[PDB]
Design a protein around this ligand. Structure first.
Ligand SMILES: Nc1nc2c(ncn2[C@@H]2O[C@H](COP(=O)(O)OP(=O)(O)OP(=O)(O)O)[C@@H](O)[C@H]2O)c(=O)[nH]1
Ligand SMILES: [Mg+2]
Ligand SMILES: [Mg+2]
Ligand SMILES: [Zn+2]
Lengths: 199, 386, 131, 136, 52, 263
RNA sequence: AUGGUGAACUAUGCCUGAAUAGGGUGAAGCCAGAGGAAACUCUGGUGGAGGCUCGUAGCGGUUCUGACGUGCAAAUCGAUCGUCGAAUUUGGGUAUAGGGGCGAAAGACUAAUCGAACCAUCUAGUAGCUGGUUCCUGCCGAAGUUUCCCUCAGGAUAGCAG
RNA sequence: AGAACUGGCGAUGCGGGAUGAACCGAACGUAGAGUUAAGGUGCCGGAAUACACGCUCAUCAGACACCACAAAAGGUGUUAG
RNA sequence: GUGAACAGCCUCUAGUUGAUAGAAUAAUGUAGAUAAGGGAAGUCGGCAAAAUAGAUCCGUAACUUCGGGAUAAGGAUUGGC
RNA sequence: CUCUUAAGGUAGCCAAAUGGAUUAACGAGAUUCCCACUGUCCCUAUCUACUAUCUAGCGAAACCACAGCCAAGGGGGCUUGGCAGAAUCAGCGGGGAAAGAAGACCCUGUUGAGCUUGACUCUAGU
RNA sequence: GCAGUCAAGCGUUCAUAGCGACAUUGCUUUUUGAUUCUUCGAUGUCGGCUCUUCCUAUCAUACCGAAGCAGAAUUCGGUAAGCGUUGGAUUGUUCACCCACUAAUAGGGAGUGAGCUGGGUUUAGACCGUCGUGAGACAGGUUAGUUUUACCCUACUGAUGAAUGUUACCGCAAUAGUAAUUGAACUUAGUACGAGAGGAACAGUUCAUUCGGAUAAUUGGUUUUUGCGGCUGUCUGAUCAGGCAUUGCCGCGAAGCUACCAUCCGCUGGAUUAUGGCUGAACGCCUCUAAGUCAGAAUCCAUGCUAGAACGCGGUGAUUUC
């Protein structure tokens, strides 16, 4: 029982914690695709959701055997037989948990942007100036270095004009292309210009 | 099993065994160190405390919620008639304890100390330091040799004193003895002091002042044989339980096959020697300096003593110490007041106190009038007066 | 100390005090508010049916009549005749604002007294005319 | 004390224990408030969490508006009925037990408190003292 | 919480002791040591009342 | 403890029958067991019994058996030791289920349902004496008991079962006899329930009382007429609400949920 | 098993005597008044019914973490409770006797004795199993194994010792 | 686990194994002297704080049930191959 | 005499004044009480206490075998002269 | 050999006022809830009498191999340690083959006797 | 677990007679966090009030280490048992669950079957079910039901005490016990850190939680002070002054006892753990370790506090005239 609910605790905090990619808000719903891949994201959690259920099943089935155990040896073997199965289920979870651990680290470090506030996007080619605008309009630490893709994600900074919080968004830069294929770096900006309101 | 509901024990195992003390007189167990440099100073005074009363003040405690705001409290009065010095004992330090090796006495001693040494005054021919002072004739010599001994050896000097119970409203004639330690520097200064103070007297001001964290010891209020329930603070078993509801129900187990030293039983309660420490002196009064109960704030010329006196006790006609809170012990005892053992500016022990009104209402009933002048004025003319 | 005076005069089981009854019989607003009232759901006679003297709701209109003709009523009607006792009295008796106490007794003698009597006349008319 | 209570809370005698009905002083439309827990209360064996004047308690409405019923909510006590000592020397007590309902920050539901709010409760919580008509 | 015995607190306190907080005590010892000397001289005059 | 007692009598019985409150049989059905039975144990036969066919009108019972005889056989039934309906119908039905299993030597028959629906009473009205205990309270039977008739058939009776669905909701579990009304904390809040279920004419006929608005009135006007109120002089909300919620489930006040519309 | 003695306790029947405050309710009958063709239908009385009701003495014995447990007592004491005009309580007389009586049925009661009273005799009833079994020294000194009776018990028989 | 044989105990003290049904020694009349068995020789305790060659430092070594169990391995612990 | 009362309480006539005593006033008991604020949070369980109580007048529901239920419930009073 | 789903709108036709046991009343019968009230409880404190207690007189009983401090080991006493100072009083309820309810609750007898059946053999009665 | 797969090795010597560690593949039910309302025969007693102690396998408090540890909050690990670990609801049962406070509501052992109980031992009464031709017994289920010590020895708690010349006063301290705990307020600050949302801490101050030791000025409680007054019934011819009502009842009531229901007080020196270091070999680099050495946890030993060995000890007073 207690080893069961050790796992069914630990997984439930993952499933409850992670942001629930559809039914967020279409800007974010997109952005987490363009970073983490939405199918791998949804699978990896759903694996953990399945592995939650099998541990409960294994707990509930063995406990019901273990009430007919007629000696110490039989009971001891049934116990080890339960905990081996749980260990086997969790050993089969090596690839998702390694994936999720790294998305957790990244997704914490995203900037909060409100879609609903007054914003402004700041877009163009690489190497134009449009970071050093964001550096000088607002307080923010974004790098100003003479080569193409220095910024690789959406940076943010706020400023008050007319006693009102705005938010600038510096955004890595776009090339012209055949436009079916552009990069996960470039696509952030396109979805930023698409989804968000604002100037 | 494992109790299944953790809960503190009942009572302190430090204060044990819970028995009767050896004497109506808690003996001091420790004195402050010996900053061999300072001027010589008595470390403890013994008096008789005999009161309780109610002092307001305003409490210039920067920080607290009562800053610049008037507080009431309880303070106890220890009456403290001046002490007189009649011996010195020198203790040599050893690989074993501290050994004393020389008591010296004051030529002439009061009837009081003599009465101490006697269990039946009303017969004994009173034949004590007679033979002692007999020796003490001629250049006295012998005593000089013994003082010399102390100077030479010895690593603390202790002063013997007594009280003047013949000045307390108390009636017991027999005075006490004590010992008190001198703290100033060298055996030489200590012993010279004691000599140039033999037969002399030491007041209460010259051992204390206002605002001073002093700690009292005493052997303190007896209630005789008492119950397990009101000796340790145990619960009472529900109601109409067989073989009584005022007790610890389970007292033991199959192992060990013994009642244990930790299971709160019935026995004595009170008449233990307790130390309570960090009590602040408030007001040190002088039996001459009339208008004690007055204040820079009151001016209303009146003594500490309340109407119809204190209860079970007279009228305070001498150096009285006020304190705050409650010394252990009941009215008429003897509390020995030890100072501090350690510097202690827990910033409390610092705020210079100013009393705004001392209560001198009757304690033998419900207080209503301070001075009988107040009372009479209020009532007006009564019957037989006029 | 003992059981009767405890379990009548706990703080929980307190009656209204005579000062405030005097002040509610003083002026014809605070009478006629208490005579009318709304329909309360809580109070015995669904509101209504209320001696102002003994500050007390009855069930019925009939069990008012039997109350009014009784020594438990006439008890309080005597108690509310004079000056109703406040801190001004017990202060003045020491010797401490006499002049405020005397100005109060003057106004209760002259202005308030016969007003509050002439209300009690209209209570005696109103209750007996309704009943 | 926690959130809302400004400054050091100071000791007074514990009037109300758990499961003890007290009146509602504010004008939200609760009649009376049944105490179910006391915030900032200790743990002792067999002891009952006792509130006092100027303490935050979880409280269910027993009689009142249907909306306010059927849910626990915080409340500050404003009259005690059990006597307590002021540190200027007098013991005192109010006519009856009373509370006012409020959020965990210490901000009030009702616009005005009827009756005399206690003096310690006014110092400790500012937003009670704003809705207090009568202090003491 | 920190205990009574905590090294941080007792190392803190010992810095306080030395400074302002013993100076109070070492003034008070000098205030009393006067009164103990001035207590004698009264009693030495009380002898000189008899020596007259 | 009771769901264990259930899965016993399903495993023991050779025809489960499933009794249904003929006020509101869709609410008082349960899925769940029937979904289990088809998957695990198809050889167990299964059959509804509408009963409390007194407590609705005659067309309504006739309708419900029409709308349920689609999925399962059904009887309309009414249980009393003396004065029954459907008794010879049900015996006839069981004696068929026996004569199919002519090898068997015996055939047990179980009585699953919600609480307070009439399992123990149906067993009594088959036997024609008092054999199981009964009461107006929900939880009267606490454990199974075999009861013989005809030698070759045995009746069983498990205790009642609620399946633990999220909705449901609290008032929905109330207005079929499941909760003992004594233990609910505020009964007052649920009375707008019975005003919704009942026709106002019927509720006006019963007590008796005349008109109002809101339940909070309806309790007060009732409680003043009943004379049922506390010392000085508050009308009793809790107890009078408590008694209405009883009279509802006991069958002193007439209501019924409608069948599906005809076609 | 034989032959005796018990109904002074107690169970039931019979004959003859005795005993049981004060309140609450208010049945039939009857009177007056108000309606009616009559049956009778309302109002006010009177009257004093009942295995009715509150409750004394009486008879009983519910409950209490009751008192007391070599006790006052081999069943008591205290409080609380049931019933209290009759299928009531009770004195004396009388009938029923043991494998019987008597039983508003508990295998209750039948002299502190009851799924079969008490007393004497046959009688030292029966021993499977338990407990006990009385001085000294010297010398010799085992056996827990076969084999059969269908088996367990109960044993026959061989072997070991003098 | 069930068969076969031979020892030991039961009817049996005594020496040693700190103590002990089955382990090591051991032919019980009463005494004296001598010499040993098994086991021992820092002190308790009769008898070498003997002699000789090596190995070991354990922040609770080892002094042993041994020809096992936890056992197969982990160590920048030491010595010899 | 009080009162509805051969209830309880106090008296007259008549009859007892018998029960091992004395000195203290610890804990634990037996019997009996009171308690701020809260008011069943106690407990398996409101067990046990508390509260109610006599009389007069107002008033009295569901159900009913129409007799009851009913002292339902719930109110207003009580001395002395 | 062939064969069984019709009843329709908030209360229906019907049968000798009712459709009933969902039965009034009664209960030291069993159980749940609400008001009132409270030391049941938070949390205990105090008071009265009679005990206990000390004295004078009087003066039993249970029970009793001998005993009476602990730790570890021996498949209360022995082995190895801790230790250990006369004589005692009031409490106390842990331990004492200190008792004591000690029988129970299982197992075995060919053994007791109470009761019942187409068990065997008889038998009153009919 | 079963069935294999690779192969560091065992198998007297040994690759391919059989074994065989560490790794590793097979499903026990759908790859898109859907639900998955699955509750499927414990044939044996435990469960709880009171109270103590122990273990650590640490839930919280102390100090460290590691993490995308920016703060803030948290997770994982190390030393650590000094000190805490609660309030209620639920028996149509609770081998559990929920919601509420909380710094936290960790897990165990010896339990508390003679200290007291509730279920169950458990007999005689009774009813319903199943089985039996029946007497009866049980797949059940429901209700009613007397075991009552201590006065003995020991242990535990308090209390006296002969004898070491007599007697008195003042002291030392072997040994034993030992105690304090947790939170948040101001200030540092709206600073550090942050694009923002938000947001600390050491110095310096103030209160409370749990626990402990006292104490009774004041507030509350208690009243045979039967202190003063009042009330009913009866009794002393009436007033008066009183009696009885198992302390007759009501009010107030000093004294005494007493309550987080009232007030006061509760510490600072040495040596360490984890870890962080210094010089520095072994080993011509290097290393916190081998020799040596500095810091450092609520730990440990003292200080302080309680008792004072009745076979531990010191200082000092007086020492009978028939
Ligand atoms: N009018 C009517 N009432 C019925 C009928 N059957 C049952 N009832 C009522 O429903 C109540 C419940 O009967 P039960 O048999 O206890 O219901 P149950 O849940 O099966 O009973 P348990 O099995 O003991 O839980 C009884 O009080 C009956 O009065 C019916 O046919 N008609
Ligand atoms: Mg760039
Ligand atoms: Mg039912
Ligand atoms: Zn009035």
């Amino acid at each position: 029982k207690y080893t069961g609910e050790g796992f069914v605790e630990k997984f439930e905090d993952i499933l409850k914690g992670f942001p629930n990619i559809n039914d967020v808000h279409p800007f974010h719903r997109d952005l987490m695709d363009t970073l983490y891949e939405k199918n791998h994201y949804k699978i990896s959690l759903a694996a953990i959701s399945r592995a939650k259920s099998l541990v409960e099943q294994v707990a509930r089935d063995y406990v019901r055997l273990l009430k007919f155990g007629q000696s110490l040896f039989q009971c001891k073997q049934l116990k080890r037989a339960a905990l081996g199965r749980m260990a086997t289920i969790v050993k089969k979870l090596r690839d998702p948990l390694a994936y999720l651990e790294q998305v957790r680290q990244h997704i914490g470090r995203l900037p909060s942007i409100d879609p609903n506030t007054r914003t402004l996007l700041i877009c163009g080619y690489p190497n134009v100036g449009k970071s050093s605008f964001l550096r000088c309009i607002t307080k923010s630490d974004v790098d100003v270095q003479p080569y193409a893709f220095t910024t690789k994600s959406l940076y943010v900074g706020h400023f008050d004009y007319k006693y009102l919080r705005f938010q600038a968004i510096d955004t890595p830069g776009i090339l012209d292309r055949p436009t079916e294929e552009m990069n996960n770096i470039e696509m952030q900006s396109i979805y930023a210009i698409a989804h968000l309101r604002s100037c | 099993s494992h109790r299944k509901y953790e809960a503190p024990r009942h009572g302190h195992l430090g204060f044990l065994p819970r028995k009767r003390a050896a004497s109506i007189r808690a003996r001091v167990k420790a004195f402050p160190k010996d900053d061999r440099s300072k001027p010589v100073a008595l470390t403890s005074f013994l008096g008789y405390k005999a009161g309780m009363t109610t002092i307001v003040r305003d409490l210039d405690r920067p920080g607290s919620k009562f800053h610049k705001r008037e507080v009431v409290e309880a303070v106890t009065v220890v009456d403290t008639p001046p002490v007189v010095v009649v011996g010195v004992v020198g203790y040599v330090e050893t690989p074993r304890g501290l050994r004393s090796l020389t008591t010296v006495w004051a030529e002439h001693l009061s009837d009081e100390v003599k009465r101490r040494f006697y269990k039946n005054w009303y017969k004994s021919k009173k034949k004590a330091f007679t033979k002692y002072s007999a020796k003490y004739a001629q250049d006295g010599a012998g005593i000089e040799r013994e003082l010399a001994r102390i100077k030479k050896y010895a690593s603390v000097v202790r002063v013997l004193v007594h009280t003047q119970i013949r000045k307390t409203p108390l009636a017991q004639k027999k005075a006490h003895l004590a010992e008190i330690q001198l703290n100033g520097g060298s055996i030489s200064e200590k012993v010279d002091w004691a000599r140039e103070h033999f037969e002399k007297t030491v007041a209460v001001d010259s051992v204390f002042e206002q605002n001073e964290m002093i700690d009292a010891i005493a052997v303190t209020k007896g209630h005789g044989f008492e119950g397990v329930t009101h000796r340790w603070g145990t619960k009472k078993l529900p109601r109409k339980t067989h073989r009584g509801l005022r007790k610890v129900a389970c007292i033991g187990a199959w192992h060990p096959a013994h009642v244990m030293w930790s299971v709160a039983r019935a026995g004595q309660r009170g008449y233990h020697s307790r130390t309570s420490i960090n009590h602040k002196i408030y007001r040190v009064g002088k039996g001459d300096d009339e208008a004690n109960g007055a204040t820079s704030f009151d001016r209303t010329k009146k003594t500490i003593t309340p109407m119809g006196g204190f209860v079970h006790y007279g009228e305070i006609k001498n150096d009285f110490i006020m304190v705050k809170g409650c010394i252990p012990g009941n009215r008429k005892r003897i509390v020995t007041l030890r100072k501090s053992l350690y510097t202690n500016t827990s910033r409390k022990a610092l705020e210079e106190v100013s009393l705004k009104w001392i209560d001198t209402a009757s304690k033998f009933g419900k207080g209503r009038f301070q001075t009988p002048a107040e009372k009479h004025a209020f009532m007006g003319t009564l019957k037989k007066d006029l | 100390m003992g059981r009767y005076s405890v379990k009548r005069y706990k703080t929980k089981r307190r009656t209204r005090d005579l000062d405030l009854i005097y002040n509610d019989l003083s002026t014809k607003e605070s009478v006629q508010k208490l005579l009318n009232q709304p329909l309360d759901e809580t109070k015995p006679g669904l509101g209504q049916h209320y001696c102002i003297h003994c500050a007390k709701y009855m069930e019925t209109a009939i069990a008012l009549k039997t109350h009014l003709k009784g020594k438990v009523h006439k008890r309080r009607v005597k108690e509310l005749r004079g000056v109703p006792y406040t801190q001004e009295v017990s202060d003045a008796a020491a010797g401490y604002n006499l002049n405020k106490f005397l100005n109060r007794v003057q106004e209760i003698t002259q202005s308030v007294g016969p007003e509050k009597e002439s209300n009690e006349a209209l209570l005696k008319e109103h209750l007996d005319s309704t009943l | 004390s926690g959130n809302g209570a400004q400054g050091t809370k100071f000791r007074i005698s514990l009037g109300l224990p758990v499961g003890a009905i007290m009146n509602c002083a504010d004008n939200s439309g609760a009649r009376n408030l049944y105490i179910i827990a006391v915030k900032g209360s200790g743990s002792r064996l067999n002891r009952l969490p006792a509130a006092s004047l100027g303490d935050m308690v979880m409280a269910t409405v027993k009689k009142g508006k249907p909306e306010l019923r059927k849910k626990v909510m915080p409340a500050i006590v404003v009259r005690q009925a059990k006597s307590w000592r002021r540190r200027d020397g007098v013991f005192l007590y109010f006519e009856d037990n009373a509370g006012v309902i409020a959020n965990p920050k210490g901000e009030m539901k009702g616009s005005a408190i009827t009756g005399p709010v206690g003096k310690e409760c006014a110092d400790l919580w500012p937003r009670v003292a704003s809705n207090s008509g009568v202090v003491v | 919480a920190k205990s009574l015995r905590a090294s941080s607190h007792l190392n803190a306190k010992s810095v306080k002791r030395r400074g302002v907080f013993q100076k109070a005590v070492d003034a008070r010892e000098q205030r009393i040591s006067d009164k103990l000397k001035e207590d004698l001289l009264k009693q030495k005059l009380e002898d000189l009342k008899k020596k007259e | 403890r009771i769901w264990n007692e259930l899965y016993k009598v399903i495993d023991s019985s050779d025809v489960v029958i499933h009794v249904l409150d003929a006020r509101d049989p869709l609410g008082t059905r349960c899925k769940s067991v029937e979904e289990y039975m088809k998957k695990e144990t198809p050889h167990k036969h299964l059959i509804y019994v509408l009963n409390k066919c007194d407590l609705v009108p005659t067309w309504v019972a006739a309708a419900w058996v029409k709308h349920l005889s689609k999925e399962r056989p059904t009887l309309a039934f009414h249980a009393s030791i003396t004065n029954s309906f459907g008794k010879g119908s049900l015996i006839q039905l069981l004696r068929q289920f026996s004569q199919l299993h002519t090898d068997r030597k015996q055939i047990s028959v179980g009585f699953i349902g919600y609480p307070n629906t009439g399992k123990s009473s149906i067993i009594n009205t088959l036997r024609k004496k008092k054999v199981c205990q009964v009461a107006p309270i929900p939880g009267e039977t606490k454990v199974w008991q075999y009861i013989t008739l005809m030698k070759r058939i045995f009746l069983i009776d498990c205790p009642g079962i609620v399946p633990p669905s999220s909705k449901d909701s609290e008032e929905d579990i109330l207005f079929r006899g499941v909760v003992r009304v004594e233990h609910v904390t505020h009964p007052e809040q649920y009375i707008p329930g019975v005003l919704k279920r009942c026709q106002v004419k019927h509720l006006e006929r019963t007590y008796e009382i005349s008109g109002w608005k809101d339940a909070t009135e309806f309790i007060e006007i009732l409680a003043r007429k009943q004379g049922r109120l506390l010392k000085g002089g508050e009308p009793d909300e809790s107890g009078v609400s408590k008694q209405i919620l009883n009279d509802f489930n006991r069958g002193k006040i007439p209501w019924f949920v409608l069948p599906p519309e005809k076609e």
